[PDB]
Design a protein around this ligand. Structure first.
Ligand SMILES: *[C@@H]1O[C@H](CO)[C@@H](O[C@@H]2O[C@H](CO)[C@@H](O)[C@H](O)[C@H]2NC(C)=O)[C@H](O)[C@H]1NC(C)=O
Ligand SMILES: *[C@@H]1O[C@H](CO)[C@@H](O[C@@H]2O[C@H](CO)[C@@H](O)[C@H](O)[C@H]2NC(C)=O)[C@H](O)[C@H]1NC(C)=O
Ligand SMILES: *[C@@H]1O[C@H](CO)[C@@H](O[C@@H]2O[C@H](CO)[C@@H](O)[C@H](O)[C@H]2NC(C)=O)[C@H](O)[C@H]1NC(C)=O
Ligand SMILES: *[C@@H]1O[C@H](CO)[C@@H](O[C@@H]2O[C@H](CO)[C@@H](O)[C@H](O)[C@H]2NC(C)=O)[C@H](O)[C@H]1NC(C)=O
Ligand code: IDQ
Ligand code: IDQ
Ligand code: NAG
Ligand code: NAG
Ligand code: NAG
Ligand code: NAG
Ligand code: NAG
Ligand code: NAG
Ligand code: NAG
Ligand code: NAG
Ligand code: NAG
Ligand code: NAG
Ligand code: NAG
Lengths: 775, 773
RNA sequence: UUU
RNA sequence: UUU
C-alpha cells in the first residue's frame, strides 16, 4: 500500500494547516545528518546525537527551514553521559546557516561551543546557547542578531559546567538588540547586572549568579519588563544539595529601595534564596500590577510577623514565603502579620519551612476574609498540634496542605531545594479535582476518632497517606465527613477486622487502602475483604501492595464498583491449586470493568478463575506474574473482555486462533515474554482486534497466514520491536510487508532489527534489500 | 589435567571413608537414566526429572547401590508444575529392584504410583511412597517388607492430591513388620487408628486425617513409642488457609482417658488442631518422661486457667498453647493457672493467640520459679498495655517474645496455620544474649523509663513499630549492656548526632527502612552520629532513600561493616559536587561496604580515593553501572572481594593485575560483556573466584585465560553466555572438558549458541575433531 | 545527555 | 516439582 518505503531514521509529520513538515531525529545515535531529509523541511530536530560538525552541506537543500533543534551533540563533560563522553566540541563551519533565509529558531545548546556562532541569518528570532562554554559577551559578536527577540545564554559557567572566571559582558552589549524580549543569563557566574539593556525586555533571568548588589539604575529603562528573576544571588546555603557559596558576612543581595521604580508592568518577581532579612515597602510603590512574588529561602522569619510591604500588593495572586526559618529555632506558633488581610487578590499562599510547634485557629485570622484564597500550603513545618476544625472557616479553599508535619491527636518532591528548577533537558523544551482537599499526608496520626473532623462536612478529599494509623476501623471514625468523595488511606496500618469499616463515608467514590500490608503479613489474623458491600457509590478501590494471602470472607460484593486495583498481593496463595474457596472472590463485583491483578505471583491460573470473574470485566491485567502457561480458550468465559495485559511474563506460545478464544478482545499486550513463533493462523478472522504488542519476545519469523491483511488493516498499532528476526530468504514476505505497510509500527528505525544471518546482523529490516532471493 | 573428560550430566562424589560413590542427577531435565553411571555407585539420586519408566535395565550394572532417590518424576497434577504436567504415571517393570542385593533406601515419592512396588529386596530398611495415589494398604502387599524399619505413606489422599474415598488399612496389616520403627500415614483421609501395630514402633504420625475417635486398645502394645502425632483430627478450622472440615457437632477428637497408659517411653505428644476443650490429667498418669507437648489450635482458653494436668508433667521441656482463644472474645487479662509452677523442667513456653488486652506482671507469677525457662512466647495476642519492667523478674530467659501486638505507651513466617509444617520438598540477634522482641507493635514514642530495670538486655528488637522521633541519646538510658538494637522499619529522625550514644555497649545497629524523614527535602540529617559509638561493629542503613546529609563525613574507629544499600549516593555524588566524596573515609576500620542499589550509573573520580584504607569487600551490584575505570582500583589496596553483578558493564580491564594485586573474588555476573581483553588475567595469581555468568561472551582465548591463573581458581563461573563453537574455540572447549576447576552448570547451561550445527549443544559434549583433519 |  |  506504499510504493516508496520510508527509510529515513526520523519521524516525519505534516501539519498542512501551518505548512510545517516536521522531521524529528531525536536520539537516533547519528554520526551524520541523515541523507534524504525532505526538501520541504521546516522543523528539524537532531538533539542527542553525535554529529561532530555542521557545514554548508548540512542544510544545503533545506532552504525552507524555520527551526533547527541541534542540541546536545556534544554536551559538557559533567553534564553528559559518562559512558559516551564527547571527544570534541561541535565544529560549525562558515556559511553553515547564512543561506537559511527563513530560519527563525536555532537551538545549539549542549555542544561545548566556545563563542557565539556567527553568520546567522537576519530572520532569526530565537537563539539558544545554554550549556556551552561561552562566558564573555562582546557587542561585536551580537551585531548579527539585530532582529533577535529570545536569547538564552545560561548554564555556561556554574558548578556542573565551570569556566573558572567571572562572566564578562561588555557595556551596552545588548543595547542595540532593539527587539530583544527575553534575556536569560542564569547559572553563569555573572557579577553585575549588565547595562544598559534594551527597553523592549519583557523577561529577564539573572538567577544563580554572583551578583551582590543591584545598582539603583540597573533596571531604569525597562518599563516593559514583566518577569524579573534575581534569585540565588547571595544564596541561603543551609541544607543546599549543591555546592553553595554565600555572600560575605551573611550579607543579603543588596537592592536599593528605588531599584524597581521603572518596572510599572512587572507581573513576576522572584527573590528566592537571596538571604533577605527585610522586604522594604518602598520596593513596591510604583509596581501596582505584581501578580507573583517568590520570597522563599531567605531569612524573613521575623519579617513575616510584620510585613508592611503586603499593603502595597492588592493585586498579588501568589505569595511564597517558604523556608525562612531561623537556624536552630523551633518556634512555638506562627506569627502572621495582620498585613496579610490586605492581599485582596491572593489565590495561593505558601509558607513551608517556617518551623513551629502548634497551629491555632486565631493565627490564620489575617486570612479569614481573603475571598479568592484557593491554596494554603503549610507543609514541612514540624507542626505537632493542630485542631483540624479551624478549617471550617476555609470552606472556600480548594487545597489545604499540611503534608509532612508531625501532627497527631502539585509541586515536585524536590522543589525548594533544587538548584535550577526551570532547567531544560536535552530531550524537550491526584484528588484535587473532586473539590475541597485536606492533605494530612506524611504526618504522625496514629489514631483517629470522629470528633477529629468536627465541622469539616464540606470536605471532598481527605489525604491520610503515610500516617501511622494502626486501628480497626469500624465505621465510627469518619462520621462528620458526609460529603467526602475520595479518601487516600494508603501507607498506613489498617486492620480490616470489621466489614463495617468506612461505611460512614456514604458519598465515597474512591478509596485507596494500598500499602496497608502490616496486619496482612501475620498469620491467623481475621481480615474482612467484604467491607465493600456497604459503600453504595464506590467506583474505584485500590488495594495494591497489601501482601494479601488470606481472607476470612470468601467474596467481595459491590453494586457500584467499576475499578479494582489488586496488584502486589498473593492470589497465588489464595488460589492454591486444590483450594476452591476463593475462586469467586471478585464474581459479585457486578459492575466491575477494570481489574488489575498484576504482580500476584500467578505462575499459572487455576481453572475456575475465569469463570469466577464478574460478568462485565473489560480490562484485565495479569502482567508481571511469572505466568509460564496460559489456556487461551478460557478467555471465552470473559464475554466483555476488550483489553488483556499479559506483559512481563513467561509465555512461549500464542493461541492457534485468537478469534476462537475471544470474540470481544480488542487490545492484546504480550510484550516482554518468551514467544519464539506465531501459530499458523494466529489472527485469522480476529475482526475485533485493534491493538497488538508483541515486542520484546524472541520471534524469528512471521508468515502471512498468521497476519491476514483484513485484520492488519484494522490495527491502530502493531508493536514488533526487539525480537530475534531472522532475515533469510524465508522472511521475504515479512520484510516486504514491513517495508510497504501503512500500519503504525514504532521503532522501525531503531529497534526492528535482524539478528542474522551474520551478513545482515544488526541491520534494520526496513532497509533490507532481498533481491538476491528473486534472481 | 584430566585424561578422560567427565561427560555424565550428574555430579559424582567419592566418600572413600564410607565406601560411597555419590551420583547426584537432581534436576537435569533427564528423560532416561543417563548411560555410564559409575558401576561402583552406592547413592544414586534422580529427583525432579522426567524418566517415564524403570526396568531391569535401569540398574543392571549398579549392583552396589544402597540408596535410590527416584522421587518426583511424575508429581501429582495439583502438586507439580502446571507448565510441564506429567502425562502418565511412572511405569515400574517387574524385577526392577530384586537384584539390588544391597539396597537399603528406596524413595519413590511423587510418581503417581497406584500400588506398593513389589519385588523389593529383603535388605530394604527405608521405603518412601509419599505423594503417590496409594490409598489401600493390604497385608499381602507388605510381606516383601519384612526387614523394613522406616515407612512413609503420607500425602496419598488429601485436598491437594485427592483420592475421593476413605483410606483403607487392613486389620493387622503392619503387625508382621517386626523391625518397623517409623510409620507415617499423615494427610491420608484415614478414619481409624490402624490396629494392631507392631510394638517395635518408635514414631507414629497420624496427623491431618479423619480420625474421629481413639479406641482404648489403639496404643496398647506400643511401649517403645517415643513420638505420637494425632494433630489435625477434628481440626480447629477458624481462619484455616486450606480447605478445612471440622468434626460434626463441634466435636473434638475423643481420646479415652487411659488411651496413653502404655506409652511409658513417650517423649513427644502432638495434639495440634484437635478442637480439644479439656485436657484430662488422667491422660498422663503413666507417662512421666514426656518432653514436648503441642496443644496449639484447640479451644483450651478456659482450660489454661485451670490446667490440673500440668501437675503430671514434671519433665516437660516444651509446652505450646498457642491459638486457643475463643472466637470473638477479647479478654482483659491472661488467666494462667498456678499449675504452671509445677513444670520444673520447662525451657520453652509458647502462648500465641490467647488474645487479651493487658499484660501485668502478676499474671506471670506462676512462672517466677521455673528455673530452666528459656523462651516465653506471647506473640500475636493483641496486647495493648505491658509494663516492660515486669521482665526484670525474668533475666534468666534467653528470648521474651512480644512480636505482633498492639503495645504502645525463630519459627517460620507461616507456622501455626500451615497444613503440614513437616512436609518434604522434592529437592537474628538471639546469640547476643537476652532478647526482648517488640517487633511489629504500635510503639510511637520511647523514653528512658520504658526500659527501667532491664539493664541486663543484650538485644532489643523494635523493628516495625511507629517510632517517629528525634533521638538525642536520652531514650535508651537503662539499657547499659545492650549489644544489638534492631530499629528497622520505623521513622527515625536523625536530627541529632548524639542519637544512640547512650548505648555504650552497642555492637550492631540496624536503622534500615527508616526512609520517611529522608524523603522530604530540606530536612537536617546527621550521618556522623557514629563517632560516639565506640564499640559499634556493624551498622545497617539499607533502604533509607538517603540523598542528602548535613554532615560530610561518617567517623568511627570501630565500625567494620557498613550496609548502605538502597540509597541515593548517585545524588550525593552528582558530578560537580565534591562534598561527600569522603563520606566513608574516616570509617578507619571498615572492611565491608555494601553500596549496591544506589543508582550509581557511573562513579565520579575520587570515590575510590575516598574509600577507607582497610576496605576488603565492596559491593557495587544493581547500580546500572555503564562504565568503570578499572585503574582506580589501585587505590583500594586491601580489596579482596569486588561485587559488580547486575550492572551494564561491557568490558573488563586490559590487565587485571595492573588494577589490583589483592583482588581474590571478582563477581561480574549479569552484565553486558561481549568479549575479554587479550591478556585479561595475565599474572593475576592471587585471584581465586571469577563469575562471568549471564553475560554475552562469544569467545575466550588462552591469552585472556592463562592456565597458570585458571587452575588456581576455587570456582570459575561461565554459564549463560553466547559461546560460538567454531574451530577458533578449540582451546576453550578442550580446556573446559579437561579442567580440574569447578565450573557449575556444565551439564545444563554451558552451551554453544552456534554455529547452527552445534546450536544449543553443551560444550562439555562437543566434538571438534573436524578441526584437526 | 542542560534537571 | 510433596511446603
Ligand atoms: C516549528 O518552528 C516554529 C518556529 O521555530 C515554532 O513556532 C513557535 O511556536 C511557539 C510555541 O509556543 C510560539 O510561541 C512561537 O511564537 C512560534 N514561533 C514562530 C517563529 O512561529 C513551531 O512551534 C515549531 N513546531 C514544531 C512542531 O516543532
Ligand atoms: C566563578 O568566578 C570565580 C572568580 O570570579 C572563580 O573563582 C576562581 O577560581 C580559580 C580556579 O578555581 C581559583 O584559583 C581562584 O582562587 C578563584 N577566584 C575567586 C575570587 O574565588 C570560580 O571558579 C568561577 N566559578 C565557576 C563555576 O567557574
Ligand atoms: C547414602 O545412602 C545411605 C543409605 O541409604 C545413607 O545412610 C543413612 O543415613 C542416615 C542418617 O542418619 C542413618 O540414620 C541411616 O542409618 C543410614 N543408613 C544406613 C547406615 O544404612 C547415607 O546417608 C546416604 N548418603 C548420601 C550422601 O546420600
Ligand atoms: C475422604 O473420604 C471421603 C469419604 O469419607 C470423600 O468424600 C466423598 O467424596 C465423593 C466425591 O467427592 C462424594 O461423592 C462422597 O459422597 C463423599 N463421601 C462422604 C462420606 O463425604 C473425600 O473426597 C475424601 N477426601 C479426599 C481428599 O480424598
Ligand atoms: C488471633 C486473632 C484472630 C481473630 C482476630 N483478628 C483480629 C484483628 N485483625 N484485629 C484485632 C484488633 C483488636 C483485638 C482483636 C483483634 C483480632 N482478633 C481477635 C478478636 C476478634 C474479634 C473480637 C470481637 N470484637 C475479639 C477478638
Ligand atoms: C526545614 C527544617 C530544617 C532544619 C530541621 N531539621 C529538622 C529535623 N530533622 N527534625 C526536626 C524535628 C522537630 C523540630 C525541628 C526539626 C528540624 N529542623 C528545624 C529545627 C531543627 C533543630 C532545632 C533545635 N532542636 C530547631 C528547629
Ligand atoms: C509578631 O512579630 C512582630 C514582629 O516580628 C511583632 O511586632 C508582633 O508583636 C508579634 N506578634 C505576636 C502575636 O507574637
Ligand atoms: C477544636 O475546635 C472546635 C471548634 O472549631 C471545638 O469544637 C473542639 O472542642 C476543639 N477540640 C479540641 C481538642 O480542642
Ligand atoms: C496524598 O499524598 C501523597 C503523599 O503526599 C501523594 O503521593 C498522593 O498522590 C496524594 N493522594 C491524592 C489522592 O492526591
Ligand atoms: C466502634 O468504635 C467506637 C470507638 O472505639 C466505639 O464507640 C463503638 O462502640 C465501636 N463499635 C460499634 C460502633 O459498633
Ligand atoms: C463477610 O463474609 C464472611 C463470610 O464470607 C462473614 O464472616 C461476614 O459475616 C460477612 N460480613 C458482611 C458484612 O458481609
Ligand atoms: C486498561 O487498564 C490500564 C490500567 O490497569 C490502563 O492503563 C489502560 O489504559 C486501560 N485500557 C483501556 C482500554 O481501558
Ligand atoms: C471455535 O471453533 C469451532 C470450530 O470452528 C467452533 O465450533 C466453536 O464454536 C468455536 N468457538 C468459539 C468460542 O468461537
Ligand atoms: C526483629 O524482628 C523482625 C520482625 O519480627 C525480624 O525480621 C528480625 O530478624 C528481628 N531482628 C533480629 C536482629 O533478629
Ligand atoms: C533529649 O530529649 C529528651 C526528649 O524529651 C529530653 O527529655 C531530654 O532533655 C534531652 N536530653 C538531652 C541530653 O538533650
Ligand atoms: C556532625 O557534623 C556537624 C557539622 O555538619 C557538627 O555540627 C556536629 O557536631 C557533628 N557531630 C559529631 C558527633 O561529630
Ligand atoms: C562480601 O559481602 C557480602 C555482603 O555484602 C557477603 O554476603 C559475602 O559473603 C562477603 N564475602 C566475603 C569474603 O567477606
Amino acid at each position: 500500500a506504499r510504493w516508496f518505503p520510508k527509510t529515513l531514521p526520523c519521524d516525519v509529520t505534516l501539519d498542512v494547516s501551518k505548512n510545517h513538515v516536521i522531521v524529528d531525529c531525536t536520539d537516533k545515535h547519528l554520526t551524520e545528518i541523515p541523507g534524504g531529509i525532505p526538501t520541504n523541511t521546516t522543523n528539524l530536530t537532531l538533539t542527542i546525537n553525535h554529529i561532530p560538525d555542521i557545514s554548508p552541506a548540512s542544510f544545503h537543500r533545506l532552504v525552507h527551514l524555520v527551526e533547527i533543534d541541534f542540541r546536545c551533540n556534544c554536551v559538557p563533560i559533567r553534564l553528559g553521559s559518562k559512558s559516551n563522553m564527547c571527544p570534541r566540541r561541535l565544529q560549525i563551519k562558515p556559511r553553515s546557516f547564512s543561506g537559511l533565509t527563513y530560519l527563525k529558531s536555532l537551538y545549539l545548546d549542549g555542544n561545548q561551543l566556545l563563542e557565539i556562532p556567527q553568520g546567522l541569518p537576519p530572520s532569526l528570532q530565537l537563539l539558544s546557547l545554554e550549556a556551552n562554554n561561552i562566558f564573555s559577551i562582546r557587542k561585536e559578536q551580537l551585531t548579527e542578531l539585530a532582529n533577535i527577540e529570545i536569547l538564552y545564554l545560561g548554564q555556561n559557567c556554574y558548578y556542573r559546567n565551570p569556566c573558572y572566571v567571572s562572566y564578562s559582558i561588555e557595556k551596552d552589549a545588548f543595547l542595540n538588540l532593539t527587539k530583544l524580549k527575553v534575556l536569560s543569563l542564569k547559572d553563569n557566574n555573572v557579577t553585575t547586572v549588565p547595562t544598559v539593556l534594551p527597553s523592549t525586555l519583557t523577561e529577564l533571568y539573572l538567577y544563580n549568579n554572583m551578583i551582590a548588589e543591584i545598582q539603583e539604575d540597573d533596571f531604569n529603562n525597562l518599563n516593559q519588563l514583566q518577569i524579573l528573576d534575581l534569585s540565588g544571588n547571595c544564596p541561603r546555603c543551609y541544607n543546599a544539595p549543591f555546592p553553595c557559596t554565600p555572600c560575605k558576612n551573611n550579607s543579603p543581595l543588596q537592592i536599593p529601595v528605588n531599584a524597581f521604580d521603572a518596572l510599572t508592568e512587572l507581573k513576576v518577581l522572584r527573590l528566592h534564596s537571596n538571604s533577605l532579612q527585610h522586604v522594604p515597602p518602598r520596593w513596591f510603590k510604583n509596581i501596582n500590577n505584581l501578580q507573583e512574588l517568590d520570597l522563599s529561602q531567605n531569612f524573613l522569619a521575623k519579617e513575616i510577623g510584620d510585613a508592611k510591604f503586603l499593603h502595597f500588593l492588592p493585586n498579588l495572586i501568589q505569595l511564597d514565603l517558604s523556608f525562612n526559618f531561623e537556624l536552630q529555632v523551633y518556634r512555638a506558633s506562627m506569627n502572621l502579620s495582620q498585613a496579610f488581610s490586605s492581599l485582596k487578590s491572593l489565590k495561593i499562599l505558601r509558607i513551608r519551612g517556617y518551623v513551629f510547634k502548634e497551629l491555632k485557629s486565631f493565627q490564620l485570622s489575617p486570612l479569614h476574609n481573603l475571598q479568592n484564597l484557593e491554596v494554603l500550603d503549610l507543609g514541612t513545618n514540624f507542626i505537632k498540634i493542630a485542631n483540624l476544625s479551624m478549617f471550617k472557616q476555609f470552606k472556600r479553599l480548594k487545597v489545604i496542605d499540611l503534608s509532612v508535619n508531625k501532627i497527631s491527636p502539585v509541586l515536585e518532591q524536590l522543589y525548594y531545594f533544587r538548584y535550577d528548577k526551570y532547567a531544560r533537558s536535552c530531550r524537550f523544551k491526584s484528588c484535587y479535582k473532586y473539590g475541597q482537599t485536606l492533605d494530612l499526608s506524611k504526618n504522625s496520626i496514629f489514631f483517629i476518632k470522629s470528633s477529629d473532623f468536627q465541622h469539616l462536612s464540606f470536605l471532598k478529599c481527605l489525604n491520610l497517606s503515610g500516617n501511622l494509623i494502626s486501628q480497626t476501623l469500624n465505621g465510627s471514625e469518619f462520621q462528620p465527613l458526609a460529603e467526602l468523595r475520595y479518601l487516600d488511606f494508603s501507607n498506613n496500618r489498617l486492620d480490616l477486622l470489621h466489614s463495617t469499616a468506612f461505611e460512614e463515608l456514604r458519598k465515597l467514590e474512591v478509596l485507596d487502602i494500598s500499602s496497608n500490608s502490616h496486619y496482612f503479613q501475620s498469620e491467623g489474623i481475621t481480615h474482612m475483604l467484604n467491607f465493600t458491600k456497604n459503600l453504595k457509590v464506590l467506583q474505584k478501590l485500590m488495594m495494591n501492595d497489601n501482601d494479601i494471602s488470606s481472607s476470612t470472607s470468601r467474596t467481595m460484593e459491590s453494586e457500584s464498583l467499576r475499578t479494582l486495583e489488586f496488584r502486589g498481593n498473593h492470589l497465588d496463595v489464595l488460589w492454591r491449586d486444590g483450594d476452591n474457596r476463593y475462586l469467586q472472590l471478585f464474581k459479585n463485583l457486578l459492575k466491575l470493568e477494570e481489574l488489575d491483578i498484576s504482580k500476584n505471583s500467578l505462575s499459572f491460573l487455576p481453572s475456575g478463575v475465569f469463570d469466577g470473574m464478574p460478568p462485565n470485566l473489560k480490562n484485565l491485567s495479569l502482567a508481571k506474574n511469572g505466568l509460564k502457561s496460559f489456556i487461551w480458550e478460557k478467555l471465552r468465559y470473559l464475554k466483555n473482555l476488550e483489553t488483556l495485559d499479559l506483559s512481563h511474563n513467561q509465555l512461549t506460545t500464542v493461541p492457534e486462533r485468537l478469534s476462537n478464544c475471544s470474540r470481544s478482545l480488542k487490545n492484546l499486550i504480550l510484550k516482554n515474554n518468551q514467544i519464539r513463533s506465531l501459530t499458523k493462523y494466529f489472527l485469522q478472522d480476529a475482526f475485533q482486534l485493534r491493538y497488538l504488542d508483541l515486542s520484546s519476545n524472541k520471534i524469528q519469523m512471521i508468515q502471512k497466514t498468521s497476519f491476514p491483511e483484513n485484520v492488519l488493516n484494522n490495527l491502530k498499532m502493531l508493536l514488533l520491536h526487539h525480537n530475534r528476526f531472522l532475515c533469510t530468504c524465508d522472511a521475504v514476505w515479512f520484510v516486504w510487508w514491513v517495508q510497504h505497510t501503512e500500519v503504525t509500527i514504532p521503532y522501525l528505525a531503531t529497534d526492528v532489527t535482524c539478528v542474522g544471518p551474520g551478513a545482515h546482523k544488526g541491520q534494520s529490516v526496513i532497509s533490507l534489500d532481498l533481491y538476491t532471493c528473486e534472481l
